[PDB]
Amino acid sequence: QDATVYVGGLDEKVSEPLLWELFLQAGPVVNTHMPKDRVTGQHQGYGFVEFLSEEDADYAIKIMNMIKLYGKPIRVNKANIFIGNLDPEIDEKLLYDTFSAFGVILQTPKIMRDPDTGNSKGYAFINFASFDASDAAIEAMNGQYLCNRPITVSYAFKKD
Amino acid sequence: SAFDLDVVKLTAQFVARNGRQFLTQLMQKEQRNYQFDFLRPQHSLFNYFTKLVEQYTKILIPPKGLFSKLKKEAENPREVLDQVCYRVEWAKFQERERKKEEEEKEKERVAYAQIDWHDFVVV
Amino acid sequence: METILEQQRRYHEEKERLMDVMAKEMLTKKSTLRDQINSDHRTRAMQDRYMEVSGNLRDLYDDKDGLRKEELNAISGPNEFAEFYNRLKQIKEFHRKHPNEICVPMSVEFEELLKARENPSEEAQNLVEFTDEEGYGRYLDLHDCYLKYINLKASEKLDYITYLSIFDQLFDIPKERKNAEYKRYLEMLLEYLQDYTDRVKPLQDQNELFGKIQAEFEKKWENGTFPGWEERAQRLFSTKGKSLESLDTSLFAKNPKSKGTKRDTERNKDIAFLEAQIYEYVEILGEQRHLTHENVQRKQARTGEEREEEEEEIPYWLYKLHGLNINYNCEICGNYTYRGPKAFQRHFAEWRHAHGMRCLGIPNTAHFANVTQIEDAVSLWAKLKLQKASERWQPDTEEEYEDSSGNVVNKKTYEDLKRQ
């Protein structure tokens, strides 16, 4: 897990030897793994590249971070408001700093991860201090231009 | 982080003995080729340096132990218990004020989510 | 050292942290009497520590009056500051962050969820200062005092209710003589009552209460504290009456009243002070004595069981064909028990067997696949180790120390011979 780098944000043009060919300049990528879905039978955008040394994986994570690969925000990492279609290049501290401009955050946010890879699932949950920050996130942040990924902010629970 | 904290404590001790706002022992040190990034207010350590300077100024008070001796806080446990009870009452009043502010914010959020947003009038 | 600047601010921060801990202890609600007594003892210990810190900080003002002339001088300044900065310009190779400058006194004055006790008060226990019969200040133990009174009176006609009725008197006639041996038991009963009063309220000032009791004993009890309408003025030491105040003032400095008797003011002053302290403890803790008497009456009126309850509180053919009903003991693989021949070979190439081999020390080699033993595993790891083939690069240096003989110097011998 230390020598392997988890890549997120892969489109349909990216393939299993294509990621190994793109990561060959960063370091000696020994193997590439792409988990296939059960309903569609294709990649879900997240994969793994197992290299030989941990320094090559660190250089690939520091070089290929927030890159625009196949029209997709590909990024390598070390393997009541709901935000969907978020970029995997952002972290919890980066999401807390991005959410601090609209309103005040009550605590540190959390992002959902896949049970197989564990880098990024695609959705996240963040809680605001009051309902005014949630309304400002649903008015402004729900549709704002993020890092090559259109996010969507919505209410997790609402009572009619 | 011990050397930076010691430098901040030395700057707070040297700046508290000044007779003016700008005529201090640290303003002339900035022009004497001494790098001090904690003097600018843009850094996060400046908020702690201001609290250290405030504590150094409060350590120079006449009831702080320079020319007088405290008798109520040092020789009366009942006065300390009354001060602790007053601090607990002030904390309870602050918690009640925060609960009232949260209730007012919830009432404003309930009133804003129930008003009609289709009756537009441009005058 | 900055004793007037840094040490005074540190003492003020410690006093503020102690006051914040006392306010957090007083703001929290209580549910039990023993936990409340432990919190009161911890608050009393924190108040004593804050008073000691204030007394230590209040004495650091002798050199401050001499150093204030040099500290407030605007002619000085950045010279000594630059000298201190050059003294603080040492090697910064100690890459270690210390966030416990103010967080450590905050954590020392706090408690945990498993045990509600502070870090200086971690060794404190309520069972070392109070007995089980007292109930952490709920009642008072009077069985030993009643046994001592029955041993001193030499009679079995005094029960616990009679002893409680005799001990309830404050200014009435005593049960025995004042010059008898009952004063030695009364002094012990007063010394126990003083400790019971000091244990029932640790947050109260015991020294101020003792000084007030001494002032009331000296200024009031020694000057006729019980006026009448021999009955006008009574003396506690001499145990005699007086006609008027002038006769009592003339007899207060008399020769039998000073030292010419066995109950004078010279020898029987401590017994009178102990009796006054016992009377003050009975007047201050009368509700606890009434609760102890009610508990004794409830224990006497109960039965034996009530007193004990109060004191206690499928394919078999396929199995035979595929190779079932058989196992294999992989000792190197954690001594696991595998299946038949199908799992036999599988047991040599797996995660558990690999972890066991790695923990045993032998590397996972293909030749050691069919091996399943300890001694045999070590023999394989030794004999199948790096044999004579592929030696250490075939070292043959033959340095030029002689140029005509000597070549046994290896790659390191000739190097050391040619270096020096």
User: Which chain B residues touch A135 with a CB distance below 8 Å?
Assistant: 109, 112
Please answer whether residues A92 and A98 qualify as being in contact, where contact means their C-beta atoms are separated by less than 8 angstroms. no
User: Which chain B residues touch A159 with a CB distance below 8 Å?
Assistant: none
Query: Cα(C358)–Cα(C341) distance, rounded to whole angstroms?
Result: 24
Please answer whether residues C227 and C248 qualify as being in contact, where contact means their C-beta atoms are separated by less than 8 angstroms. no
Asked if the Cβ–Cβ distance from A130 to B109 is below 8 Å, we say yes
- How was this structure obtained? cryo-EM
**C276 three-state secondary structure:** helix
Query: Cα(C20)–Cα(C22) distance, rounded to whole angstroms?
Result: 5
Question: Is B88 part of the contact surface with chain C (CB cutoff 8 Å)?
Answer: yes
Structure tokens at B97: 């004020």
- Give the contacts of A92 (CB within 8 A, at least 6 positions apart): A108, A109, A110, A111
Asked if the Cβ–Cβ distance from C71 to B17 is below 8 Å, we say yes
E strand or H helix that includes residue A5: strand A4-8
E strand or H helix that includes residue C328: strand C328-330
Chains that touch C (3 or more CB pairs under 8 A): B
Of C412, C390, C391, C409, give the one whose Cα is nearest residue C400.
Answer: C409
User: Which chain B residues touch A129 with a CB distance below 8 Å?
Assistant: none
- Report H helices in C244-315: 245-252, 255-258, 269-284, 286-301, 304-312
Query: What Å resolution does this PDB entry report?
Result: 7.1
Of C10, C13, C30, C32, give the one whose Cα is nearest residue C21.
Answer: C13
Residue C303 Cα, gap to closest chain B Cα (Å): 45
Q: Give the count of Cβ contacts less than 8 A between chain A and B.
A: 12
Query: Cα(C273)–Cα(C276) distance, rounded to whole angstroms?
Result: 5
Q: Report the relative pairing of strands A123-126 and A110-111 from DSSP bridges.
A: antiparallel
Q: Does domain A81-155 have CATH number 3.30.70.330?
A: yes
Structure tokens at C301: 């009126």
Query: Cα(A141)–Cα(C387) distance, rounded to whole angstroms?
Result: 69
For residue C144, how many C-alpha atoms fall within 13 Å in the half-sphere facing its CB?
10
Structure tokens at C232: 């006008």
**A155 three-state secondary structure:** strand
**C338 three-state secondary structure:** strand
Residue pointed to by tokens 């947050």: C203
Asked if the Cβ–Cβ distance from B77 to C82 is below 8 Å, we say no
User: Which chain B residues touch C63 with a CB distance below 8 Å?
Assistant: none
Residue pointed to by tokens 């009126």: C301
Structure tokens at C415: 């190097």
For chain B, the helix, strand and coil percentages under 3-state DSSP, each to the nearest 5: 60, 0, 40
Please answer whether residues A26 and A32 qualify as being in contact, where contact means their C-beta atoms are separated by less than 8 angstroms. no
Query: Cα(C335)–Cα(B66) distance, rounded to whole angstroms?
Result: 76
Q: How far is CA C51 from each of CA A55, C45, C404, rounded to the nearest angstrom?
A: 57, 10, 90
Which value, to the nearest 10 degrees, does the dihedral of the CA atoms of residues C6, C12, C13, C16 take? 180
Question: Is A116 part of the contact surface with chain B (CB cutoff 8 Å)?
Answer: no
Of C54, C204, C47, C51, give the one whose Cα is nearest residue C121.
Answer: C47
Query: Which sign, positive or negative, has the C-alpha torsion A109, A115, A116, A121?
Result: negative
Among chain A residues, the shortest Cα distance to B109 is held by A131
Query: Which B residues, 52 through 111, put their C-beta within 8 Å of a C-beta on chain A?
Result: 102, 105-106, 108-109
Q: How far is CA C278 from each of CA A42, C190, C191, C192, C285, rounded to the nearest angstrom?
A: 91, 5, 8, 9, 10
Among chain C residues, the shortest Cα distance to B76 is held by C205
Q: How far is CA B95 from each of CA C103, C189, C207, rounded to the nearest angstrom?
A: 24, 49, 37
For residues C287-317, b (16+ Cβ closer than 10 Å) or e, as one string?
A: ebbeebbebbeeeeeeeeeeeeeeeeeeeee
Please answer whether residues B60 and B66 qualify as being in contact, where contact means their C-beta atoms are separated by less than 8 angstroms. yes
**A33 three-state secondary structure:** strand
Query: Cα(B81)–Cα(C21) distance, rounded to whole angstroms?
Result: 11
Structure tokens at B52: 């250290």
Please answer whether residues C406 and C399 qualify as being in contact, where contact means their C-beta atoms are separated by less than 8 angstroms. yes
- Give the contacts of C99 (CB within 8 A, at least 6 positions apart): B1
User: Which chain C residues touch B75 with a CB distance below 8 Å?
Assistant: 51
At position A59, the amino acid (one-letter code) is: Y
User: Which chain B residues touch C84 with a CB distance below 8 Å?
Assistant: 10
Of A150, A158, A159, A10, give the one whose Cα is nearest residue A83.
Answer: A150
Other CB atoms within a 10 A radius of the CB of residue C205 amount to 17
Structure tokens at C171: 């200014």
Structure tokens at C336: 């696991």
At position A60, the amino acid (one-letter code) is: A
Which value, to the nearest 10 degrees, does the dihedral of the CA atoms of residues A93, A98, A103, A107 take? -10
Which value, to the nearest 10 degrees, does the dihedral of the CA atoms of residues C87, C91, C95, C96 take? -30
Structure tokens at C241: 């009456």
Beta bridge partners of A69: A72
At position B98, the amino acid (one-letter code) is: R
User: For an interface test with B, which of C81, C95, C201 has the most B Cβ atoms less than 10 Å from its Cβ?
Assistant: C81
Asked if the Cβ–Cβ distance from A135 to B106 is below 8 Å, we say no
In sequence order, what E strands does B34-114 have?
none
At position A122, the amino acid (one-letter code) is: G
Asked if the Cβ–Cβ distance from B1 to C99 is below 8 Å, we say yes
